[PDB]
Amino acid sequence: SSVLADALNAINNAEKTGKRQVLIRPSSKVIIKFLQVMQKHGYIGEFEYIDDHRSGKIVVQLNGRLNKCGVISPRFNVKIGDIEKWTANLLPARQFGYVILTTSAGIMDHEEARRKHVSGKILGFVY
Amino acid sequence: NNYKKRLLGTAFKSSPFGGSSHAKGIVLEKLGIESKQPNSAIRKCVRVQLIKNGKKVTAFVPNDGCLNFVDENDEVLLAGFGRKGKAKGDIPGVRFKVVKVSGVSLLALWKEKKEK
Amino acid sequence: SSRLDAELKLAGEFGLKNKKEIYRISFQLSKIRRAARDLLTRDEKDPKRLFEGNALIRRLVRVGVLSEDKKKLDYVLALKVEDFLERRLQTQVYKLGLAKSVHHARVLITQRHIAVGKQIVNIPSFMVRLDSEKHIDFARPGRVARRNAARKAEASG
RNA sequence: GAAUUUGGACAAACUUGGUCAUUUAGAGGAACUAAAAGUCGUAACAAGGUUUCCGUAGGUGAACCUGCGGAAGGAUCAUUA
RNA sequence: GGUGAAAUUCUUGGAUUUAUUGAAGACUAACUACUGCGAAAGCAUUUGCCAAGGACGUUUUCAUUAAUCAAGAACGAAAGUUAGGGGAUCGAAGAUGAUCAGAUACCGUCGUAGUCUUAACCAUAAACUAUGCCGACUAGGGAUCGGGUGGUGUUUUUUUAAUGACCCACUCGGCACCUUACGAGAAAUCAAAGUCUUUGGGUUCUGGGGGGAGUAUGGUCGCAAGGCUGAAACUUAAAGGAAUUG
RNA sequence: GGAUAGUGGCCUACCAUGGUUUCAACGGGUAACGGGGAAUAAGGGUUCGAUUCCGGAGAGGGAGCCUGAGAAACGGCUACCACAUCCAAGGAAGGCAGCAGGCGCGCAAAUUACCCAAUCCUAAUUCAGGGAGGUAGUGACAAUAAAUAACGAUACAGGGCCCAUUCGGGUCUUGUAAUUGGAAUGAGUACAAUGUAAAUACCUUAACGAGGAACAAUUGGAGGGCAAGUCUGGUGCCAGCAGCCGCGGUAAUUCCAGCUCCAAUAGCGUAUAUUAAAGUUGUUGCAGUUAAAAAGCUCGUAGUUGAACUUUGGGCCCGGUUGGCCGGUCCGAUUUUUUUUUCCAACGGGGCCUUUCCUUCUGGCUAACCUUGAGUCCUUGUGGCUCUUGGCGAACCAGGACUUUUACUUUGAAAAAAUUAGAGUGUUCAAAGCAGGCGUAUUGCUCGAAUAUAUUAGCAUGGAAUAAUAGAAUAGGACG
């Protein structure tokens, strides 16, 4: 009934207990894709190794701070006056931040599509 | 989208209406009210009809020695003491409150100023 | 209280410069927008940050501004209030000898005397910039400033 | 054209009745509120001196009482623990 | 008889106490709990007929069909209405008997309605778990319902085994519940009332100081009682939760 | 078909039942002109709109018209309804929602002035006209400034400062009932304004005069929230205070009044809205077991939402902008300890390879490549390109044959000025203004008047993540 906060709210829902991560939704190009941008900037460990009905692709070890909770979010705007603003979601300007936006092109990160002046949807936000 | 709710409402139509800095009006009767519980005194007020709406209201000649007006004829200006939809008030149910008049008040003054 | 001890502060400024009101308020609000708009750097080097840069930085100023740095002028929010105060003749014209002591100053600033190198300047809260010319002018003549030139060694700050 | 005038289409306005929306008068009637208390009785609180409240239905000088069937927001007088 | 103690009454009418028998309508004791089943209200005698329901067991069959819903609707305790059947018990109204300063009550005792019933209304309740529905995730143990195995435990099936029946032990499923950390809260408490600085998974709903009030008016529903919808004037600064002490 | 300047139910006729609606029709309300923009915004938002500028609509209500290029007209008629004026009683007139001015109305808004000078407009080759407009009067009406004092002084000091047996060297704070000079210093008044030949008596100068308490302060507050030596006399739950909390019942920290003092000050109340505070109306961002708040119970339409799957992952080629010093630059051209060995970042973009059509056949160009007909430069020839023989795809024009439909997101164009953000410049500073600045002063030079925001819808674009849509099932698939 909503694969996003579904699983990011299990990582989130986990590291607060503290541990070595667990299973999740089913896979999703998108799940796996956030469960990438995450690793690729740090935070999480190694996306994992399942394969079933749609249960396929991965589990995913924890590691590190990653505190706290991946951000799930449930709207979608972007660019210029935007992105910067919804960068108020962030846990503080001075670096730290990361807002896993959805960018017309690419499921990208607050900066990772700040990149080639991109924009669009607001998929989430990490640490 | 959706959803409008309560609190402060549009429909208005009260008793001074003009949210006036007063309301001129002739001095029908001189009814010195009487204090409410806890406190206790003869709360000298005045009843008068508002030239405008004609509507009659009674309010404290609030001063301190000035039933100087007390001119059954003469015409104060009254004017509420925002409670708002209420009275102060040691002074039981008086809505607005005496103003200036015969049109010109400190309320005590010209010449000197007496007091109150 | 802080409201109170503040209402102390202001009166302190009240001749930490020389005023008599809430021109302290004037300079204050100034410090706001200065900062404010400023503090709204934010941002990058947007060619905007650029014009705005050497721009507001061209606050300098003489008798006015800082000294030599920034960038971050919110320092002013510290200063400005406590600095922009000086500068103007309201301040920097007692700290120049002629004026016997603030008061004994504004009065001539007004009272015709005290003039910024040609033309008086009654506006007893102008602003100074390239000051060395802030003499008496006078045009029998401006007495209080013309002989009491003990400023003949007014090497101050 | 003036007069003058046939028919038209516009169409004021007159009358009479309708329909809305906005105000408003009244013998009297019946609430409320300022109400702290005056007077009758004790309903609630202490199983309040008949445990209390929920409907619903009767009956009452006022509070209420009672009847069915709920709930403890309880009686802890305790066949169980 | 009948209570605190009485009384009102019943009674040489055969009561009160037993003796055979039958009569009538309610009602389902005891077992009954740590609870089973139901959308919910609510559901305990026997047998049978009627159609349903979850959980389990497989991957059977489909493949997107779904999730919550203003409207609209089906069921909805008890009283209460309509009409008939009866009519045991108790029992509004109503009487009287005590009791009180005062008793229209609370304690007797008669007794109307009603209580049951069938066809039809009524649609309210402390209609409760005062806690919306769907899916996640977050932590331990015990105990009572279907499925797996070892089966051991005692008997079926009997000349015996085994099996069988209950039955024991390890599991899982889903049930109703209990007992204790992080985390939540104003508290109390909470396996959520948990997660998120102070979004965040989707939705239905209701609240915005007390009163004035669930009243005024309007429209609709109904036979009625009533239900449903539902104000404003004015009037007050406290009313209200939890806790702690007298 | 009739009218229109002209579409069309605009109006006629004839014929057919249609068109809207819970995604809110229709109807009701507006103390409703719209939009510029206004106010208080951390943000998100509330709230405001008839002063200017655009667009609209009307000159008492309401129709109908002549005039004309243009009007349903205001400063033109016509009739009705409505007010209402002069009458020789016959009849004749009118529309201040244009300036002034009056009444009325109310809480609430000025003069019967002067003028064409400016800005412009209207009439014909001038310089006519203009309560359009501009000057004045009124007006702390919202705004910028900003004096109501400045000196040191003489001595009295009450003494505080380094203590020394030094009874005080006096650097010094201040009350000064005492006393100096500053021919200072603004408001009144001969001159004159490059000035609108009226502002002319106006800001600007200037000269004539001008502070022994007057040349001068106010509004409120002194219980707490609030912060004020706060005390002294009067009052007694009377009078009165008091936004709420509360004061007052002879000794009042809240009334009254003096003293003093606090706060802001040419300005302070008081009323009244609003905006903030208010995360008390909540998308950000509320609450709901008892505190306000789950509907008795399920059904289920509209609405709002809805599992995951289909292109990746590897390899090659040109790029400048931030960078470690000037720089077209990877074994170094600089920021290093030396009596050699000496690290390249990361950012983003286009193209093309891989079982991978971009819509396109006819075929229309370039400048790019396959690459060589003639040649080459020099640092070790793939560090550079003159060169035309065969010969790249999509740039790319345009007829002619076909395309599955959207959200979103990226620059972009175009349409307003003032409004606001904000560059520029000493308007004396400021508020503003869009001026200005050099000199070399008998017809001289010189810069400006920026950028920004353009938010919904439209248009145009680049993108193919997230989310819809459709397609080959009895094959009525799909090409050439």
Short mmCIF file of all heavy atoms in Angstrom, two decimals, chain F residues 3 64 114 173 179 240 243 313 315 361 381 412 446:
data_model
loop_
_atom_site.label_atom_id
_atom_site.label_comp_id
_atom_site.label_asym_id
_atom_site.label_seq_id
_atom_site.Cartn_x
_atom_site.Cartn_y
_atom_site.Cartn_z
P A F 3 -33.85 42.94 -44.14
OP1 A F 3 -34.67 44.14 -44.40
OP2 A F 3 -33.47 42.08 -45.28
"O5'" A F 3 -32.55 43.34 -43.29
"C5'" A F 3 -32.55 44.48 -42.44
"C4'" A F 3 -32.35 44.09 -40.99
"O4'" A F 3 -32.44 42.66 -40.85
"C3'" A F 3 -31.01 44.45 -40.35
"O3'" A F 3 -30.98 45.79 -39.87
"C2'" A F 3 -30.86 43.41 -39.23
"O2'" A F 3 -31.43 43.88 -38.03
"C1'" A F 3 -31.70 42.24 -39.73
N9 A F 3 -30.90 41.06 -40.09
C8 A F 3 -31.27 40.07 -40.96
N7 A F 3 -30.39 39.12 -41.07
C5 A F 3 -29.37 39.51 -40.21
C6 A F 3 -28.13 38.93 -39.87
N6 A F 3 -27.69 37.78 -40.40
N1 A F 3 -27.34 39.56 -38.98
C2 A F 3 -27.81 40.70 -38.48
N3 A F 3 -28.94 41.35 -38.71
C4 A F 3 -29.69 40.70 -39.59
P G F 64 -34.90 50.87 -25.33
OP1 G F 64 -35.21 49.58 -25.98
OP2 G F 64 -33.56 51.07 -24.74
"O5'" G F 64 -35.25 52.07 -26.31
"C5'" G F 64 -36.59 52.38 -26.56
"C4'" G F 64 -36.73 53.73 -27.20
"O4'" G F 64 -36.58 54.76 -26.20
"C3'" G F 64 -35.69 54.08 -28.24
"O3'" G F 64 -35.95 53.46 -29.50
"C2'" G F 64 -35.74 55.61 -28.28
"O2'" G F 64 -36.75 56.08 -29.17
"C1'" G F 64 -36.16 55.95 -26.83
N9 G F 64 -35.06 56.53 -26.05
C8 G F 64 -34.26 55.88 -25.15
N7 G F 64 -33.38 56.68 -24.62
C5 G F 64 -33.64 57.91 -25.20
C6 G F 64 -33.02 59.16 -25.00
O6 G F 64 -32.09 59.40 -24.25
N1 G F 64 -33.57 60.16 -25.78
C2 G F 64 -34.60 59.97 -26.64
N2 G F 64 -35.00 61.05 -27.31
N3 G F 64 -35.21 58.81 -26.83
C4 G F 64 -34.68 57.84 -26.08
P C F 114 -10.47 85.20 -8.03
OP1 C F 114 -10.60 86.64 -8.35
OP2 C F 114 -11.27 84.22 -8.82
"O5'" C F 114 -8.93 84.78 -8.05
"C5'" C F 114 -7.91 85.74 -7.87
"C4'" C F 114 -6.62 85.31 -8.52
"O4'" C F 114 -6.10 84.13 -7.85
"C3'" C F 114 -6.70 84.87 -9.97
"O3'" C F 114 -6.79 85.95 -10.88
"C2'" C F 114 -5.43 84.05 -10.12
"O2'" C F 114 -4.29 84.89 -10.19
"C1'" C F 114 -5.42 83.32 -8.78
N1 C F 114 -6.11 82.03 -8.87
C2 C F 114 -5.36 80.96 -9.35
O2 C F 114 -4.17 81.15 -9.64
N3 C F 114 -5.97 79.75 -9.50
C4 C F 114 -7.25 79.62 -9.17
N4 C F 114 -7.81 78.42 -9.34
C5 C F 114 -8.04 80.71 -8.69
C6 C F 114 -7.43 81.90 -8.57
P U F 173 35.08 66.57 36.71
OP1 U F 173 34.94 66.68 35.24
OP2 U F 173 35.30 67.80 37.50
"O5'" U F 173 33.85 65.75 37.31
"C5'" U F 173 33.40 64.54 36.70
"C4'" U F 173 32.52 63.75 37.63
"O4'" U F 173 33.28 63.35 38.80
"C3'" U F 173 31.31 64.48 38.19
"O3'" U F 173 30.20 64.45 37.30
"C2'" U F 173 31.04 63.76 39.51
"O2'" U F 173 30.27 62.58 39.30
"C1'" U F 173 32.45 63.34 39.94
N1 U F 173 33.03 64.24 40.96
C2 U F 173 32.40 64.36 42.19
O2 U F 173 31.36 63.79 42.47
N3 U F 173 33.03 65.21 43.07
C4 U F 173 34.20 65.91 42.87
O4 U F 173 34.65 66.63 43.77
C5 U F 173 34.79 65.72 41.59
C6 U F 173 34.20 64.90 40.71
P U F 179 23.85 85.83 41.77
OP1 U F 179 23.19 87.15 41.79
OP2 U F 179 23.06 84.65 41.35
"O5'" U F 179 25.20 85.91 40.92
"C5'" U F 179 26.09 87.00 41.08
"C4'" U F 179 27.44 86.71 40.48
"O4'" U F 179 27.88 85.39 40.88
"C3'" U F 179 27.50 86.66 38.96
"O3'" U F 179 27.58 87.95 38.37
"C2'" U F 179 28.73 85.81 38.69
"O2'" U F 179 29.91 86.59 38.77
"C1'" U F 179 28.72 84.85 39.89
N1 U F 179 28.23 83.51 39.52
C2 U F 179 29.11 82.83 38.73
O2 U F 179 30.18 83.30 38.39
N3 U F 179 28.71 81.59 38.37
C4 U F 179 27.54 80.95 38.70
O4 U F 179 27.36 79.81 38.27
C5 U F 179 26.68 81.74 39.53
C6 U F 179 27.04 82.97 39.91
P G F 240 -17.94 59.42 41.71
OP1 G F 240 -17.13 60.66 41.54
OP2 G F 240 -19.03 59.13 40.74
"O5'" G F 240 -16.99 58.17 41.82
"C5'" G F 240 -16.34 57.65 40.68
"C4'" G F 240 -14.88 57.52 40.93
"O4'" G F 240 -14.66 57.16 42.32
"C3'" G F 240 -14.19 56.41 40.17
"O3'" G F 240 -13.93 56.72 38.82
"C2'" G F 240 -12.95 56.22 41.02
"O2'" G F 240 -12.09 57.35 40.92
"C1'" G F 240 -13.60 56.23 42.40
N9 G F 240 -14.16 54.90 42.71
C8 G F 240 -15.47 54.47 42.72
N7 G F 240 -15.59 53.19 42.99
C5 G F 240 -14.29 52.75 43.16
C6 G F 240 -13.76 51.48 43.48
O6 G F 240 -14.39 50.44 43.65
N1 G F 240 -12.38 51.47 43.53
C2 G F 240 -11.57 52.57 43.34
N2 G F 240 -10.24 52.42 43.41
N3 G F 240 -12.04 53.76 43.04
C4 G F 240 -13.39 53.79 42.97
P G F 243 -7.19 49.06 32.76
OP1 G F 243 -5.75 49.18 32.41
OP2 G F 243 -8.04 50.27 32.71
"O5'" G F 243 -7.86 47.89 31.90
"C5'" G F 243 -9.25 47.61 32.01
"C4'" G F 243 -9.69 46.54 31.05
"O4'" G F 243 -9.12 46.82 29.76
"C3'" G F 243 -9.26 45.14 31.41
"O3'" G F 243 -10.28 44.21 31.02
"C2'" G F 243 -7.96 44.92 30.63
"O2'" G F 243 -7.77 43.62 30.13
"C1'" G F 243 -8.03 45.96 29.50
N9 G F 243 -6.84 46.79 29.46
C8 G F 243 -6.77 48.12 29.13
N7 G F 243 -5.57 48.61 29.23
C5 G F 243 -4.81 47.54 29.68
C6 G F 243 -3.43 47.47 29.96
O6 G F 243 -2.57 48.35 29.89
N1 G F 243 -3.07 46.20 30.38
C2 G F 243 -3.94 45.14 30.50
N2 G F 243 -3.39 43.99 30.92
N3 G F 243 -5.23 45.19 30.24
C4 G F 243 -5.58 46.42 29.84
P G F 313 22.87 0.40 -14.65
OP1 G F 313 22.77 0.44 -13.18
OP2 G F 313 22.68 1.66 -15.42
"O5'" G F 313 24.23 -0.28 -15.07
"C5'" G F 313 24.73 -1.38 -14.35
"C4'" G F 313 25.56 -2.27 -15.23
"O4'" G F 313 24.75 -2.76 -16.33
"C3'" G F 313 26.73 -1.59 -15.93
"O3'" G F 313 27.88 -1.41 -15.10
"C2'" G F 313 26.96 -2.53 -17.10
"O2'" G F 313 27.51 -3.76 -16.66
"C1'" G F 313 25.52 -2.77 -17.52
N9 G F 313 25.04 -1.67 -18.38
C8 G F 313 24.25 -0.63 -17.98
N7 G F 313 24.01 0.23 -18.94
C5 G F 313 24.71 -0.28 -20.03
C6 G F 313 24.83 0.23 -21.35
O6 G F 313 24.32 1.25 -21.83
N1 G F 313 25.63 -0.60 -22.14
C2 G F 313 26.24 -1.76 -21.71
N2 G F 313 26.98 -2.42 -22.63
N3 G F 313 26.14 -2.23 -20.48
C4 G F 313 25.36 -1.45 -19.70
P G F 315 34.28 -0.25 -18.63
OP1 G F 315 35.66 -0.50 -18.15
OP2 G F 315 33.57 0.95 -18.14
"O5'" G F 315 34.25 -0.28 -20.23
"C5'" G F 315 35.29 -0.92 -20.97
"C4'" G F 315 35.34 -0.46 -22.41
"O4'" G F 315 34.04 -0.65 -23.04
"C3'" G F 315 35.66 1.02 -22.65
"O3'" G F 315 37.06 1.30 -22.62
"C2'" G F 315 35.02 1.29 -24.00
"O2'" G F 315 35.83 0.78 -25.05
"C1'" G F 315 33.76 0.43 -23.90
N9 G F 315 32.63 1.18 -23.34
C8 G F 315 32.25 1.25 -22.02
N7 G F 315 31.19 2.00 -21.84
C5 G F 315 30.85 2.45 -23.11
C6 G F 315 29.79 3.29 -23.56
O6 G F 315 28.88 3.85 -22.93
N1 G F 315 29.86 3.49 -24.92
C2 G F 315 30.77 2.92 -25.76
N2 G F 315 30.62 3.21 -27.05
N3 G F 315 31.76 2.14 -25.38
C4 G F 315 31.73 1.94 -24.05
P C F 361 12.55 6.88 -44.63
OP1 C F 361 11.84 5.93 -43.75
OP2 C F 361 13.81 7.48 -44.16
"O5'" C F 361 12.76 6.23 -46.07
"C5'" C F 361 13.13 7.03 -47.19
"C4'" C F 361 12.13 6.92 -48.31
"O4'" C F 361 10.85 7.49 -47.88
"C3'" C F 361 12.45 7.71 -49.58
"O3'" C F 361 13.35 7.03 -50.44
"C2'" C F 361 11.08 7.93 -50.19
"O2'" C F 361 10.59 6.74 -50.78
"C1'" C F 361 10.27 8.22 -48.93
N1 C F 361 10.32 9.65 -48.58
C2 C F 361 10.09 10.62 -49.55
O2 C F 361 9.82 10.27 -50.71
N3 C F 361 10.17 11.93 -49.21
C4 C F 361 10.45 12.27 -47.95
N4 C F 361 10.51 13.57 -47.66
C5 C F 361 10.70 11.30 -46.94
C6 C F 361 10.63 10.01 -47.30
P G F 381 58.48 10.59 -34.52
OP1 G F 381 58.95 11.50 -35.59
OP2 G F 381 57.41 11.05 -33.61
"O5'" G F 381 58.08 9.18 -35.15
"C5'" G F 381 57.62 9.08 -36.49
"C4'" G F 381 56.12 9.30 -36.59
"O4'" G F 381 55.75 10.43 -35.75
"C3'" G F 381 55.61 9.62 -38.00
"O3'" G F 381 54.33 9.00 -38.25
"C2'" G F 381 55.45 11.14 -37.98
"O2'" G F 381 54.48 11.65 -38.87
"C1'" G F 381 55.07 11.40 -36.52
N9 G F 381 55.45 12.73 -36.03
C8 G F 381 56.59 13.07 -35.33
N7 G F 381 56.65 14.33 -35.02
C5 G F 381 55.47 14.87 -35.54
C6 G F 381 54.98 16.19 -35.52
O6 G F 381 55.49 17.20 -35.02
N1 G F 381 53.75 16.29 -36.17
C2 G F 381 53.09 15.24 -36.76
N2 G F 381 51.91 15.52 -37.34
N3 G F 381 53.54 14.00 -36.79
C4 G F 381 54.73 13.89 -36.16
P G F 412 16.61 32.07 -19.61
OP1 G F 412 17.81 32.86 -19.98
OP2 G F 412 15.92 32.37 -18.33
"O5'" G F 412 15.55 32.07 -20.82
"C5'" G F 412 15.81 31.32 -22.01
"C4'" G F 412 14.75 31.48 -23.08
"O4'" G F 412 13.78 30.41 -23.02
"C3'" G F 412 13.90 32.72 -23.04
"O3'" G F 412 14.58 33.87 -23.47
"C2'" G F 412 12.74 32.34 -23.96
"O2'" G F 412 13.10 32.52 -25.32
"C1'" G F 412 12.61 30.83 -23.70
N9 G F 412 11.41 30.48 -22.92
C8 G F 412 11.30 30.14 -21.59
N7 G F 412 10.07 29.87 -21.24
C5 G F 412 9.34 30.02 -22.40
C6 G F 412 7.96 29.85 -22.63
O6 G F 412 7.09 29.52 -21.83
N1 G F 412 7.62 30.10 -23.94
C2 G F 412 8.50 30.47 -24.92
N2 G F 412 7.94 30.66 -26.12
N3 G F 412 9.79 30.64 -24.73
C4 G F 412 10.14 30.39 -23.45
P U F 446 31.33 64.80 -26.31
OP1 U F 446 31.94 63.77 -27.17
OP2 U F 446 30.09 65.47 -26.76
"O5'" U F 446 31.14 64.23 -24.83
"C5'" U F 446 32.25 63.75 -24.10
"C4'" U F 446 31.86 63.28 -22.72
"O4'" U F 446 31.75 64.41 -21.82
"C3'" U F 446 30.50 62.62 -22.60
"O3'" U F 446 30.46 61.29 -23.09
"C2'" U F 446 30.23 62.73 -21.10
"O2'" U F 446 31.02 61.80 -20.38
"C1'" U F 446 30.78 64.13 -20.83
N1 U F 446 29.72 65.14 -20.90
C2 U F 446 29.05 65.40 -19.72
O2 U F 446 29.37 64.83 -18.68
N3 U F 446 28.04 66.33 -19.80
C4 U F 446 27.64 66.99 -20.95
O4 U F 446 26.71 67.80 -20.88
C5 U F 446 28.37 66.65 -22.13
C6 U F 446 29.36 65.75 -22.08
#
